[PDB]
Design a protein around this ligand. Sequence first.
Ligand SMILES: [Mg+2]
Length: 97
Amino acid sequence: GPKPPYSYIALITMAIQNAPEKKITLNGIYQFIMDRFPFYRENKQGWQNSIRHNLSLNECFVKVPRDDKKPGKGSYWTLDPDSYNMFENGSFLRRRR
DNA sequence: CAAAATGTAAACAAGA
DNA sequence: TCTTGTTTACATTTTG
Ligand SMILES: [Mg+2]
């Protein structure tokens, strides 16, 4: 199908906010996106590289260490408290300020 | 308009 | 070899 209107910053924010403890692994972001929007089930090589790119580049996505090496691999990704509500509505179509 | 934000691709590295 | 994470580069879009 066609690509949804949501940006990569918006997609990552959805996954973090959806997590019960508001922290999510990189693979959990993949599964959240693909489960929510079937378009990203195809051609995983491209948009996942963009996902990683946005996690490191943007200050809003801060990586924090993990408890033990049991749940998956890598570290948890969380939202910088300043940019938690960086989107206006909760429809995630554009940022505020 | 200029600058910032964003999308996309890719070189690169540490580690299991 | 694969996964994760960082970084530079460039074109297009959005914002101020
Ligand atoms: Mg970051």
